[PDB]
Amino acid sequence: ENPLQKARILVNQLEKYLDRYAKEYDVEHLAGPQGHLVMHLYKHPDKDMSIKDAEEILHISKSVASNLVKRMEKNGFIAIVPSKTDKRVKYLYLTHLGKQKATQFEIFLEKLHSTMLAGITKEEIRTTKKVIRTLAKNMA
Amino acid sequence: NPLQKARILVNQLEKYLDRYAKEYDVEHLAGPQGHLVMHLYKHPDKDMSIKDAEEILHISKSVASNLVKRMEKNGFIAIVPSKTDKRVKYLYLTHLGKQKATQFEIFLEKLHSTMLAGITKEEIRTTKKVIRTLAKNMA
DNA sequence: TAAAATAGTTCTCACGATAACTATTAAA
DNA sequence: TTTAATAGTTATCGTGAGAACTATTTTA
């Protein structure tokens, strides 16, 4: 068999269903990094998150973080506000729609594990995760 | 929550493979370009159209169309209209294509061996049906 | 103060998705 | 032969990457 190809395919379909599922459940656009950042802002309302902080949370690059915050703004999930102390920093803030969505989305996450990890065991699962961990760790 | 982490671990995986391949003179082929070059090599007696690539790689119509444009630009393939069916365009490995399939097949071997080191088979075979289940679950 | 770390943007790109469109062949 | 299906392209988009570029702190 082949390991590079299969993996890529399996993710492409998985990614594609999550998009389908999430539109029907009224969390369109959040199956992905947008949803992950909305969740992070929710869980931690006390911390200032700047754009750079998003790079590190989501494990993405400069340009990717910049373009991602732009998309979230266009979608109404966030407001971007320059800092007054550090003139180069821009802060991110969940909007009202943002806050409402963080909630609908947390439900959706629950309904996912409940549906996609059916027929699988936590040992089976814990081992695949070590299968994965070591794959990872193989690239120093 | 953890399902996110999944797509992260792909982003690194995808990222390293691109570094590895360029270092090893198979640039641009860690990915669908490489997978299609292989398919053409392994089967030189089957004529393959752009649509056939949609099916081999499980991609959409436009993804396939754009992908072949990228391979042509890279030198790995030539695109030739069918003379029987004026709708169809056939794909053909170029000379550079053919040699790359070779260096790439080597790359695959090396990568596989260096990635599944310290891992058993049942562990790996169970990872499969754990993954096949997920896929099956999203049906 | 001069030089370097930092925060963000914009360029060009690879690789995925739809949807709307042109052709062309096949089917009814 | 009117209609369906098929093959490919191009539009807009989401989500990844690096590189070159501002503009602001640091810090040496």
CATH number at residue B51: 1.10.10.10
Contact B137 A118 (CB under 8 A): yes
Give backbone dihedrals phi and psi of B80, rounded to 5 degrees, phi first. Answer: -125, 120
Query: How do B77-81 and B48-49 pair as beta strands?
Result: unpaired
Quoted resolution (Å): 2.5
Closest to B114 in 3D by CA, of A2, A139, A5, A8: A139
Which of A4, A56, A129 is most worth mutating to test chain B (most B CB atoms within 10 A of its CB)? A4
Pairing of strands B77-81, B89-93: antiparallel
CB A89 within 8 A of CB A83: yes
Q: Which residues of B touch A5 (CB under 8 A)?
A: 35, 57
Q: Which amino acid is at A96?
A: H
Tell me the backbone φ, ψ of residue B79, rounded to 5 degrees.
-115, 125
Among candidate residues A131, A112, A61, the one with its CA nearest the CA of residue B1: A112
Q: Which domain holds residue B40?
A: 1-138
Tell me the C-alpha distance between A22 and A32, whole Å. 10
* A58 membership: H or E segment, kind and range: helix A51-58
If you measure CA to CA, which chain A residue comes closest to B125?
A: A128
Pick from A107, A106, A103, A101: nearest CA to A28: A101
What is the number of domains present in chain B?
1
Cα–Cα distance list, A53 to A61, A140, B5, B7, B91 (Å): 11, 24, 17, 19, 45
Alpha carbons B37 and A111: distance in angstroms, whole number? 40
Residue A42 structure tokens:
């929710």
Among the partner-chain residues B4, B58, B126, the one whose CB lies closest to the CB of A9 is: B58
Maximum separation of any 2 CA atoms in chain A, in Å: 57
Query: Are A36 and A44 spatial neighbours (Cβ–Cβ below 8 Å)?
Result: no
3-state secondary structure B18-41: HHHHHHCCCCCCCCHHHHHHHHHH
| Contact of B135 with A14, CB cutoff 8 Å | yes
The rounded distance, in Å, linking the Cα atoms of B105 and B26 is 10
Q: How far is residue A53's CA from residue A55's CA, in Å, rounded to a whole number?
A: 5
Q: Tell me the technique behind this structure.
A: X-ray
- One-letter amino acid at A119 equals G
Count CB atoms within 10 A of the CB of residue B136. Answer: 12
Tell me the C-alpha to C-alpha distance, in Å, between residue B58 and each of A51, A53, B51, B134: 35, 35, 11, 17
Question: Cα–Cα distance between A84 and A91 in angstroms, integer?
Answer: 10
3 state DSSP class of A94: strand
C1' of D13 to CA of A136 (Å): 31
> What letter does residue A77 receive in the DSSP assignment?
S
Residue nearest to nucleotide C26 (CA to C1'): B85
In the block, which residue shows the tokens 């729609």?
A97
Q: What is the C-alpha separation between B44 and A20, in angstroms, rounded?
A: 38
C-alpha to C-alpha distances, A54 to A7, A57, A86, A118, B11, nearest whole angstrom: 26, 5, 17, 32, 16
**Would you say A99 and A41 are in contact if contact means Cβ atoms under 8 Å apart?**
no
